[PDB]
RNA sequence: GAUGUCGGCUCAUCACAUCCUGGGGCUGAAGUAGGUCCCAAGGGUAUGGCUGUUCGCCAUUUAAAGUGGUACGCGAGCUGGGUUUAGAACGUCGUGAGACAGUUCGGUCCCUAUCUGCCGUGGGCGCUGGAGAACUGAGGGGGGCUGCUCCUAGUACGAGAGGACCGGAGUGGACGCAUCACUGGUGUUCGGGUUGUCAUGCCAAUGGCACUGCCCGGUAGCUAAAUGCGGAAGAGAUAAGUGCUGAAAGCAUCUAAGCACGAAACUUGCCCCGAGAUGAGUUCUCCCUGACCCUUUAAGGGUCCUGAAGGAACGUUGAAGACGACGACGUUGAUAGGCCGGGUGUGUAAGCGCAGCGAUGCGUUGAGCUAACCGGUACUAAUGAACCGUGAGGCUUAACCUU
RNA sequence: AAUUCCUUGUCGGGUAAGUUCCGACCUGCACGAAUGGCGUAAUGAUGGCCAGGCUGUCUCCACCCGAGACUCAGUGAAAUU
RNA sequence: CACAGGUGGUCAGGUAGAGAAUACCAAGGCGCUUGAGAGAACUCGGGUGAAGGAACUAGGCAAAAUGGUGCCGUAACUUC
RNA sequence: AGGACCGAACCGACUAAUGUUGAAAAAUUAGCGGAUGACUUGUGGCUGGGGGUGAAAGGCCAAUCAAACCGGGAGAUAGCU
RNA sequence: CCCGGCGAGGGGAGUGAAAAAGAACCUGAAACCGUGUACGUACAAGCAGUGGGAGCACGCUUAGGCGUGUGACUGCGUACC
């Protein structure tokens, strides 16, 4: 993410364990992310019997940071860890369907409303 | 019309009716007493001379004092003068304050001595902190090299490296005023603006088109 | 890193034109003190603007 | 960097800075008068005046609090008996800088430091 | 005696609660998305001092989830819909910093009287 | 008398034969996309791995993955893995000592800058009477990159699928700039906790010390991981080229004469440094009208009286900054400290009462204590002078005063 | 291979990797049975490889504190020439 | 050299701790002589660090991190 | 009991950070190792330069080592700068 | 006889032919750092020298481009072994 190599958490109902940043998207001539950034992930780990398996090269976007995500009111949303939601790289959007923890409301679109099942926050 | 000398005094994250809050610097705009004014027989260009803000006139010199005496007297800290930008003033005072940035919502701002001392290395120049482990010794922050060989025969002009730096300017240019707010005489400019906190500045409006 | 030839005495004197040693650049005549008045500073008997304020 | 902030950072780390100021303020309340270098007399002034403000009344509870603030039997003894009533009526300005001259042997500007209202002197030359 | 820094209090939106550490709150807010009529709430503990200026905020920890989350709500913008202060527990500190990236404890831990 | 090497990194820079957008010709190019192709140095021009390796192999970025140079750039830069690697051993060879443009393992890498450059900054003197003040531009760089999609636009063209540029719009990335409210960091001039021992005769409490003992909060500043933001309408000189009108060559033909048009580059505009620019500067404002003695006299030398406007030391000190210069400014004062209201911190002051075996809680007490900030408050220290500047300051043409 | 001209060997495996590491293969440089070989517990400040604590080495660097530099005072060298 | 270097014998006080680790400390020794100011680059020492966790480098690289005491619980291999 | 151990004191110095015109002719701090032994080490003793001495690097012999230093040969020779 | 510690160092007064013989004393260079005067340096720059030389002090300018010392400025120009 902010550094090359760097393992961070799966944030889908597709995968398990950890996955590894190879590059950032949404620009070049950098080797660091910001906040509300677009990642390039390779899967390091995850179960082969789920939709996510070792060494699929995919696109992904940030859903948590332990630095925390912000833009409109500048007021952060911080979490227990750095985490990133996988895209399909061919059809995009969240490849998984639930998770128990929430999304950042400061960087908020279709890609964060398709990845949870809490009724009192927008679906 | 003119460059209006404010003070850096306050900075605020302000709310808007978009759902966004905008980080800002808040500048006290004062009233304007115009002074002697130079016409276009004088130095060749039509400009307006202004005193915005003042001091206790215990330190004043008579040669500045005659300017204020023949026009609106205000026992000024100094003289600032301006080539036109939107227009001009009444030649003794037009009591201008927040009004100046209501016909333009864009500022250019003038280059001021930036109040960061040296700033310089690792702050506006392309140096880093170089490796410190694997027996790297006496070389931790200095570039190590800057030129090449007898080929150029010397150091290039495009390369630059200085232990220290004196008064340095360069503006942000062309940046939007977010608001001006009447009855408190407040000029809100977005985020960055040349100067430390508690600095003076000159604020000119738009010069570019 | 070193030299190439022995310096001339013109060299030494010009280099010092703006790097030699400086002091308190005189003091004023007195009015009120037991000593002679240090310019715009209090004396050791204290009387500058009034009384023995300094005693050390 | 040092910008839009005032006062003097001295040439001591913190444990050293405390231990010299603990000596100095005990000399300062006891003699009413001290001489030291001008950057150092200004920090000496700003340290001793908040202690005097807590100490301006003769009241027992502010004498117990003042012994909680500094474990010194000499500071808490001069105040609340001789010096209490001396500073009782003021609401700031419990000390003064007198710009004594330059120090001896060097061209470092010096001050004599002196409480706003005095009850004691020592007045041999600075050594 | 307060003539400037006064002008900020003249600008501030009237919505701000007066505060001491360890309130419970429910912060009523928007899903934001620019500006949107879909609302939602968050309740838990305020982990930090709200006094900041024209830019006061509620530093909630929602303490409900299984990893937790900290959310910061801007008091002076229309994102914050209404704010009720509820009862003050005990903290015996001002800011409970160990919760900014970890889940934990309530607005009350013991008692915080004289 | 040798300049100290590879690979990688620091740090770059210059030649354009341009990686790319941009203007333009052709196509065996239908339109579109390409190939072809001139013009053009301005700007942007990515990163991990295994190995001591360049190259290798592999994954990825961006619209994009360039050309060429630098004592095989740069060791009076970095490492020091490797090298004949000096030890050793492997692989090899000799009787051996000992050897390798074969190999592998850790292992020193020096120098305060004389002259020379690069960036920043000051002192001395002339700015023509002085002094202070505003100020113009001879001259030189920075931004100059570049995606996305809506409309433009299903239209020219085609057999059908299909099918463009600019312009208008919001918006991302780098590069450059400034900033500290927001969000993180720190905050040795601030509060509180806490392990241990030593102390205040003792208790309760508190403080010295162990890296500020350790720990967490923290005003104000600064700061990038956060913030705001340039990338410009217009002006001219063009390139290649599209031309007109038209010759060499009765015509034909950007071109040869002539004249319309013709790009981020170029001279600029926008920004920023700039009068020593002897091409010595313009323009505003202010102020000095006493005297005698002597010599080289557009003039200087001495002396009485006498030095204005202003300056400088000096003083506290800065939001200006290595030092200066620059600046606030000295009782006319918010310069710096206290102190108080506040933008604004912390966590419940020592003692005493009460419940309890007590730690501790609870009532006393939403307590007590507090730094830089913003505004106040003179509460506290910046005396009064002397001093550097003098009594109206060139020749000569043009303008004006008789002139 | 502490060895391999070619070769980053051929092939499986971990992986963004994969010269090294683990497993197998041999088109085997010049490996090869006292220059000794296979195999092994424990040990070396020993060599390589792997994943996790943790960490400013770095990504990308900020701020605080002190001693030189720099400030004020004192004394006052040198590589060289 | 007032120099941080090296050097054997005898004697053996406290608290907390596994101990001659280690904080402070009794008796005792003793301030290793620039100083003071500022808070530019930078050089060394010391404090602190978001998100990551070596990704920097031939190489994890000191400092940071690990440590102690009661009790549960404990692998391949083995010369048991 | 033990050329045993985790680990001091006591002694060293594989590696890191520094020093590298140093405080010190490799010491400091820190990872690190021996300590009932082939240790650590005082006192006293003993070998002299192509000669000693080496759990072996031609290592070490006055913080030194393919050969110390000094008096004679000696104005070695220098084909060379 | 003067300054100062009780010091370091010198002067003046007086001695002698001589103290420009003052105790390290013989007369006395050059390197070596500073003073004093003359003249030169604020539009300017390369082996630092020569060629031409404003000027200024001094020389009845020898009145005759000049003499002594210096030198704005500038032609031209690469140390010695």
Coordinates of C-alpha atoms (C1' of nucleotides) in Angstrom, one line a residue, chain I:
Chain I
rA1 C1' 33.8 -36.2 38.6
rG2 C1' 33.4 -33.5 34.2
rG3 C1' 38.9 -29.9 28.1
rA4 C1' 29.6 -29.9 30.2
rC5 C1' 25.9 -25.9 30.2
rC6 C1' 22.2 -20.3 30.8
rG7 C1' 25.5 -16.6 32.7
rA8 C1' 28.2 -13.0 35.2
rA9 C1' 32.4 -10.8 38.3
rC10 C1' 37.2 -11.5 36.0
rC11 C1' 39.2 -11.7 30.8
rG12 C1' 38.6 -11.6 25.4
rA13 C1' 36.8 -9.2 20.8
rC14 C1' 33.1 -12.9 15.5
rU15 C1' 29.5 -8.7 14.3
rA16 C1' 26.6 -3.8 14.7
rA17 C1' 26.8 1.8 15.8
rU18 C1' 30.7 5.5 16.4
rG19 C1' 36.0 6.9 15.9
rU20 C1' 38.4 6.8 10.9
rU21 C1' 44.1 15.2 10.8
rG22 C1' 40.5 9.5 17.5
rA23 C1' 40.2 10.4 24.3
rA24 C1' 42.7 5.5 22.6
rA25 C1' 48.9 4.0 17.4
rA26 C1' 40.8 -0.6 17.6
rA27 C1' 39.4 1.9 22.2
rU28 C1' 34.2 3.2 23.4
rU29 C1' 28.9 1.5 23.9
rA30 C1' 25.8 -2.7 22.2
rG31 C1' 24.5 -7.9 19.8
rC32 C1' 28.6 -12.0 21.5
rG33 C1' 31.9 -15.7 23.9
rG34 C1' 35.5 -18.7 28.1
rA35 C1' 34.9 -18.9 33.9
rU36 C1' 36.1 -25.4 38.3
rG37 C1' 39.6 -25.1 32.6
rA38 C1' 43.5 -26.9 26.7
rC39 C1' 40.6 -21.2 31.6
rU40 C1' 42.0 -16.7 33.7
rU41 C1' 46.6 -14.9 35.8
rG42 C1' 50.4 -12.5 39.4
rU43 C1' 55.4 -13.7 40.8
rG44 C1' 59.8 -15.6 39.4
rG45 C1' 62.5 -18.2 35.1
rC46 C1' 64.3 -19.3 30.0
rU47 C1' 65.4 -19.4 23.7
rG48 C1' 68.3 -13.9 19.9
rG49 C1' 67.3 -12.7 13.3
rG50 C1' 67.4 -16.7 7.6
rG51 C1' 67.8 -17.3 14.7
rG52 C1' 64.4 -18.3 17.8
rU53 C1' 59.2 -19.2 19.4
rG54 C1' 54.1 -20.8 16.7
rA55 C1' 46.5 -26.0 19.0
rA56 C1' 50.4 -23.1 11.7
rA57 C1' 48.7 -17.1 9.3
rG58 C1' 55.8 -17.3 7.5
rG59 C1' 51.9 -16.0 12.5
rC60 C1' 55.0 -13.4 16.4
rC61 C1' 59.8 -11.6 18.5
rA62 C1' 59.6 -3.5 22.9
rA63 C1' 51.0 -1.7 21.1
rU64 C1' 55.6 -3.5 14.7
rC65 C1' 57.6 -8.5 11.4
rA66 C1' 59.4 -13.7 4.7
rA67 C1' 63.7 -12.0 9.2
rA68 C1' 64.7 -6.5 14.7
rC69 C1' 69.0 -3.1 15.9
rC70 C1' 73.8 -1.3 16.3
rG71 C1' 79.5 -1.1 15.4
rG72 C1' 83.2 -2.8 11.2
rG73 C1' 83.6 -4.5 5.9
rA74 C1' 81.4 0.4 3.3
rG75 C1' 82.2 5.7 -0.1
rA76 C1' 78.6 -2.7 -1.4
rU77 C1' 76.8 -1.8 -6.5
rA78 C1' 73.3 1.1 -9.1
rG79 C1' 73.6 -1.4 -15.5
rC80 C1' 69.3 3.6 -13.2
rU81 C1' 66.3 8.0 -11.7

